[PDB]
Design a protein around this nucleic acid. Sequence first.
DNA 1: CTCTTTTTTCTCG
DNA 2: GCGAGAAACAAAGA
Length: 267
Amino acid sequence: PELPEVETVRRELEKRIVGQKIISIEATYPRMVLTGFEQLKKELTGKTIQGISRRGKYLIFEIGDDFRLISHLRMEGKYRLATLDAPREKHDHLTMKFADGQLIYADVRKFGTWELISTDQVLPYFLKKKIGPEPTYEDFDEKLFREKLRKSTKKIKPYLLEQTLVAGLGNIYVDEVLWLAKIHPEKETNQLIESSIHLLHDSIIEILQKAIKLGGSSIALGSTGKMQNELQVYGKTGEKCSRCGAEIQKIKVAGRGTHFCPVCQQK
DNA sequence: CTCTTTTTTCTCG
DNA sequence: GCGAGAAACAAAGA
Ligand SMILES: O=c1[nH]c(=S)[nH]c2[nH]ccc12
């Protein structure tokens, strides 16, 4: 999941578990709780969920006044709300039980993580990760963006994926964004001219906000997304580009599968 | 059978 | 510092 999917999950959860007292917490895979499962179980049991926030691709459960549970879904994490008598499925790892249902985390690849941290440590947590601004007009300052691009000789796609120029892009939306901004994924950032950086900036915001409105891409909470029907290049190798009669090509860039339209995305 | 494919952190040179 | 490659892991396809 990328920012749009995580935000969809955040919204569904917010409407359903906020106000719910945690009756108990159980784990078949305690190892994904990086700060210690027993400590998390002791601290959160009996607490009421106050809210759910999000920063980049990170889910943030506000639980009691003084704790936050930072959940990352990584590649295939999935939450669902189930009745208490629901049967365990093979890749279920954690469950948070309420009086009238339960929140189950499942993750085939076991990459997802939970971290318990205190409220006044949330901002420091994200500062230490150097997570960039949220992809909104109010937060994503183009001027700083522009100066960071001009100082680097990194390729634009992997640099955007680092989450430090701006938060929330992953492989799908970085490919869509670069297609929309007519930029080559291996373009070195210091060769980007001002007008391209401007288009890149706005496209990042516009694509991510559109995907949020369409409830994310779906290829469980957040499983009713429609953004996948609007994808222009990701996973569409060999099919025609929607800007010219060329075909989508797929290459490897700094380890990632990369879909782009050669003719519309020259350096 | 082998090899490759699908977020973030770590290692090595 | 850097970039490349691999690692965490499971399942599927070639
Ligand atoms: O290289 C990265 N690619 C993605 S998708 N997320 C990241 N976080 C930190 C580094 C990276």
